[PDB]
Write a protein that binds this ligand. Structure first.
Ligand SMILES: Cc1ccc(S(N)(=O)=O)cc1
Ligand SMILES: Cc1ccc(S(N)(=O)=O)cc1
Ligand SMILES: [Zn+2]
Length: 257
């Protein structure tokens, strides 16, 4: 029953998910002048050439593009990561207006949206076991600004009409997530959590410095989705972001000098 409304949003989550007030919650503000270059970080490896997308689902909070994670088809390695992390899904968070929508902020700047590519550590066997571990997940976060269209996003945009309401899904095979990346893999990294309930503190966050540009028309179509199910009163799926949480005893490291 959690959501993003006045009566069930981020301010209420702690009552059913007390870890909401925990010591490594996400997202956070990335203060670029406090983040430190870390020479111990290994090169980041995004290996998505064999990615197998399956389906797109409106889950009432966002939409997920789901992948076959039964083998090492699309993986993330290197950077701050030990071992191999398998891509399971991606989704976005976005705003009602271009001036908000991202979860992470950069020197307090909010972007129009934020893409999360979610991966689990293969040493734990399955996603469910991974979310019982402090190094169970790695999420690659990418900011979206409004400007020129992102060609690699259009296939996602075009299928949204078919998953307007909560619980709807559609086939989404043969989608290449490499088309959602910026040119540079420069990043910031820190230990955090899922940004939605259950808010589990299992995530190594890797947030790219370079945003991708998407067109106004593309993000406008995100905003036509519904939080509600079919036949119910329309509630536009907008502002499905959690604001920045206390950094507490954490360091944000930069991959770049
Ligand atoms: C969509 C896409 C863009 C760029 C490449 S690359 N790294 O082989 O030039 C592959 C796929
Ligand atoms: C199940 C789940 C997976 C990933 C996230 S996120 N927004 O932290 O990437 C939240 C919930
Ligand atoms: Zn997310």
């Amino acid at each position: 029953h959690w959501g993003y409304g006045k009566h069930n949003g981020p301010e209420h989550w702690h009552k059913d998910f007390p870890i909401a007030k925990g010591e490594r919650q996400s997202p956070v503000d990335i203060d670029t002048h406090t983040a430190k270059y870390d020479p111990s970080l290994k090169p980041l490896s995004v290996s998505y050439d064999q990615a197998t997308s399956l389906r797109i689902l409106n889950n009432g909070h966002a939409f997920n593009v789901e992948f076959d994670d039964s083998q090492d088809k699309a993986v993330l390695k290197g950077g701050p990561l030990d071992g191999t992390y398998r891509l399971i899904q991606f989704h976005f968070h976005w705003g009602s207006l271009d001036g908000q929508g991202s979860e992470h902020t950069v020197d307090k700047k909010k972007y129009a949206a934020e893409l999360h590519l979610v991966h689990w550590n293969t040493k734990y066997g399955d996603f469910g076991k991974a979310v019982q571990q402090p190094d169970g997940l790695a999420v690659l976060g990418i900011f979206l600004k409004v400007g020129s269209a992102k060609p690699g996003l259009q296939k996602v945009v075009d299928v949204l009409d078919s998953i307007k309401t909560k619980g709807k899904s559609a086939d989404f095979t043969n989608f290449d997530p490499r088309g959602l990346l910026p040119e540079s893999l420069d990043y910031w990294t820190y230990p955090g959590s899922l940004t939605t309930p259950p808010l589990l503190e299992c995530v190594t966050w890797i947030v790219l410095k370079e945003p991708i540009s998407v067109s106004s028309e593309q993000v406008l179509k995100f905003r036509k989705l519904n939080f509600n199910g079919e036949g119910e009163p329309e509630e536009l799926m907008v502002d499905n972001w959690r604001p920045a949480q206390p950094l507490k005893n954490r360091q944000i490291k930069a991959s770049f000098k």
